[PDB]
Design an enzyme around this catalytic site. Structure first.
Site, PDB file in Angstrom:
ATOM      1  CG  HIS A 239      -2.148  -0.978   0.865  1.00 44.66           C
ATOM      2  ND1 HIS A 239      -2.277  -2.209   1.455  1.00 44.66           N
ATOM      3  CD2 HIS A 239      -3.212  -0.837   0.045  1.00 44.66           C
ATOM      4  CE1 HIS A 239      -3.389  -2.777   1.043  1.00 44.66           C
ATOM      5  NE2 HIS A 239      -3.972  -1.963   0.163  1.00 44.66           N
TER       6      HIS A 239
ATOM      7  CG  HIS B 255      -1.450   0.257  -4.534  1.00 51.47           C
ATOM      8  ND1 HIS B 255      -1.976  -0.756  -5.295  1.00 51.47           N
ATOM      9  CD2 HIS B 255      -2.473   0.804  -3.848  1.00 51.47           C
ATOM     10  CE1 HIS B 255      -3.278  -0.818  -5.085  1.00 51.47           C
ATOM     11  NE2 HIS B 255      -3.610   0.142  -4.209  1.00 51.47           N
TER      12      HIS B 255
ATOM     13  CG  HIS C 172      -6.591   4.512  -4.087  1.00 51.58           C
ATOM     14  ND1 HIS C 172      -5.402   4.522  -4.754  1.00 51.58           N
ATOM     15  CD2 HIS C 172      -6.820   3.232  -3.751  1.00 51.58           C
ATOM     16  CE1 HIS C 172      -4.918   3.294  -4.798  1.00 51.58           C
ATOM     17  NE2 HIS C 172      -5.757   2.491  -4.192  1.00 51.58           N
ATOM     18  CG  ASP C 173      -4.651   2.473  -0.782  1.00 54.43           C
ATOM     19  OD1 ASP C 173      -5.575   2.327   0.057  1.00 54.43           O
ATOM     20  OD2 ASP C 173      -4.378   1.643  -1.671  1.00 54.43           O
TER      21      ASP C 173
ATOM     22  CG  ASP D 288      -7.653  -0.579  -4.873  1.00 51.86           C
ATOM     23  OD1 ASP D 288      -6.409  -0.346  -4.854  1.00 51.86           O
ATOM     24  OD2 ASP D 288      -8.365  -0.655  -3.871  1.00 51.86           O
TER      25      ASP D 288
ATOM     26  CD  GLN E 123      -3.836 -14.466  -4.482  1.00 44.34           C
ATOM     27  OE1 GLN E 123      -3.874 -13.674  -5.418  1.00 44.34           O
ATOM     28  NE2 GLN E 123      -4.127 -14.108  -3.239  1.00 44.34           N
TER      29      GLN E 123
HETATM   30  C1  LIG Z   1      -4.770  -7.740  -6.364  1.00 44.11           C
HETATM   31  C2  LIG Z   1      -4.207  -8.397  -5.074  1.00 44.11           C
HETATM   32  C3  LIG Z   1      -2.878  -7.716  -4.673  1.00 44.11           C
HETATM   33  C4  LIG Z   1      -3.827  -9.864  -5.324  1.00 44.11           C
HETATM   34  O1  LIG Z   1      -3.101 -10.182  -6.248  1.00 44.11           O
HETATM   35  N1  LIG Z   1      -4.263 -10.838  -4.487  1.00 44.11           N
HETATM   36  C5  LIG Z   1      -5.049 -10.588  -3.445  1.00 44.11           C
HETATM   37  O2  LIG Z   1      -5.383 -11.538  -2.763  1.00 44.11           O
HETATM   38  C6  LIG Z   1      -5.509  -9.216  -3.132  1.00 44.11           C
HETATM   39  C7  LIG Z   1      -5.147  -8.126  -3.920  1.00 44.11           C
HETATM   40  C8  LIG Z   1      -5.589  -6.844  -3.598  1.00 44.11           C
HETATM   41  C9  LIG Z   1      -6.434  -6.595  -2.516  1.00 44.11           C
HETATM   42  C10 LIG Z   1      -6.840  -7.685  -1.727  1.00 44.11           C
HETATM   43  N2  LIG Z   1      -7.642  -7.831  -0.623  1.00 44.11           N
HETATM   44  C11 LIG Z   1      -7.686  -9.109  -0.272  1.00 44.11           C
HETATM   45  C12 LIG Z   1      -8.440  -9.712   0.895  1.00 44.11           C
HETATM   46  C13 LIG Z   1      -9.818 -10.252   0.509  1.00 44.11           C
HETATM   47  C14 LIG Z   1     -10.008 -11.629   0.366  1.00 44.11           C
HETATM   48  C15 LIG Z   1     -11.260 -12.126   0.011  1.00 44.11           C
HETATM   49  C16 LIG Z   1     -12.328 -11.243  -0.187  1.00 44.11           C
HETATM   50  C17 LIG Z   1     -12.148  -9.865  -0.033  1.00 44.11           C
HETATM   51  C18 LIG Z   1     -10.898  -9.376   0.319  1.00 44.11           C
HETATM   52  N3  LIG Z   1      -6.924  -9.858  -1.132  1.00 44.11           N
HETATM   53  C19 LIG Z   1      -6.372  -8.994  -2.050  1.00 44.11           C
HETATM   54 MG   LIG Z   2      -7.290   1.173   0.070  1.00 39.40          MG
HETATM   55 ZN   LIG Z   3      -5.402   0.607  -3.139  1.00 38.14          ZN
END
Ligand SMILES: CC1(C)C(=O)NC(=O)c2c1ccc1nc(Cc3ccccc3)[nH]c21
Ligand SMILES: [Mg+2]
Ligand SMILES: [Zn+2]
Length: 313
Positions: free
Chosen positions: A68, A72, A106-107, A217, A269
């Site tokens: 962050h 970013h 935004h962050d 984002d 993921q």
């Molecule tokens: C794009 C990027 C960096 C990525 O590649 N892989 C992620 O996992 C990720 C990313 C950005 C923001 C994320 N916020 C979460 C947490 C989350 C999990 C389930 C539901 C809602 C929120 N994971 C994020």
């Molecule tokens: Mg943010």
């Molecule tokens: Zn962001």
């Protein structure tokens, strides 16, 4: 006024593409942003001396956290640039001004911790802003920097245009709270499918700009696999530190934030691409057909994570 920014040839060409990586040269990132404002908005949108002073104060107010961070901010602005450039005629003059600035800001002053952790720590910001805690703080920091002497990049706007552009920026920044993403996309999905979506309805435009903000984002999932894979490490460095801080408060963090459960990351993921990323770029591609390359790149990266689980890497 006759002073364009120009990039080297490989950057001049690749910056137009959604999957562009801004590279590891920090000192080139301010110039890349100004390049993008000049082509997206015009060389007349902002006084260059003021813009430059704004960019450098924003950079200063991003912290040295693994994900962050300043990189970013610029990455998310580039994705907005690509969406705007591929959808020329859909957005107002004020929108193109507001949104590149919203993305950069935004962050602002992120500490690498979720809204959840602020609330459980009982952080002062959690008492000042009960929902979208960090996002209300990011908007607050944007207004602060805009009010620094010689930093008002919007000074030539009328009183009412200034209010509209700050309202565009506030909504765009609030929309980057992923807790708000789910309902916003469901509502956009229903409006698109039942044929009720209307880009002249301001409340509809608001929702569409919100989805664009989520898309920009999350845009690390739309890069070439080696960018996406290494950026995922950076966000997990934040998540695992937050899990460490949860354990220090006597709270077992969720598995995603537990560094003892790294094995579970590939499957996390999948859930993230399936629950968040793919639905986001799907709905975005329905509303703005030229954004299809973000959906295609996201799908390619999902497949790469499936290969990781199957031991094919
Ligand atoms: C794009 C990027 C960096 C990525 O590649 N892989 C992620 O996992 C990720 C990313 C950005 C923001 C994320 N916020 C979460 C947490 C989350 C999990 C389930 C539901 C809602 C929120 N994971 C994020
Ligand atoms: Mg943010
Ligand atoms: Zn962001």
């Amino acid at each position: 006024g006759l002073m364009q920014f120009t990039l080297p040839v490989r950057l001049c060409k690749e910056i137009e593409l959604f999957h562009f990586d801004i590279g590891p040269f920090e000192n080139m990132w301010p110039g890349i942003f100004v390049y993008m404002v000049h082509r997206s908005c015009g060389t007349s949108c902002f006084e260059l001396e003021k813009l430059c002073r704004f960019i450098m104060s924003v950079k200063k107010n991003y912290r040295r956290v693994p994900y962050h961070n300043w990189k970013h901010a610029v990455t998310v602005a580039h994705c907005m640039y690509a969406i705007l450039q591929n959808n020329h005629t859909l957005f107002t003059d004020l929108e193109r001004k507001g949104l590149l600035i919203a993305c950069l800001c935004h962050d602002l002053d992120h500490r690498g911790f979720s809204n959840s952790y602020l609330q459980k720590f009982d952080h002062p910001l959690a008492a000042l802003y009960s929902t979208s805690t960090m996002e209300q703080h990011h908007f607050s920091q944007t207004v602060s920097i805009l009010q620094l002497e010689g930093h008002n990049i919007f000074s030539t706007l009328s009183s009412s245009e200034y209010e509209q552009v700050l309202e565009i920026i506030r909504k765009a920044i609030i929309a980057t709270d992923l807790a708000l993403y789910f309902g916003n996309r469901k509502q956009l999905e229903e409006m698109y499918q039942t044929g009720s979506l209307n880009l002249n309805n301001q409340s509809h435009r608001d929702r569409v700009i919100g989805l664009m903000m989520t898309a920009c984002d999350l845009c690390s999932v739309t890069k070439l696999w080696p960018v996406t894979k290494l950026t995922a490490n950076d966000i997990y460095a934040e998540f695992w530190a937050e899990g460490d801080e949860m354990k220090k408060l006597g709270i077992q963090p969720i598995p995603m934030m537990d560094r003892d459960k790294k094995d579970e990351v590939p499957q996390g993921q999948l859930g993230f691409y399936n629950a968040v990323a793919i639905p986001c770029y799907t709905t975005l591609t329905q509303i703005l057909p030229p954004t299809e390359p973000l959906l295609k790149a996201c799908r390619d990266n999902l497949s790469q994570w499936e290969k990781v689980i199957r031991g094919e890497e």
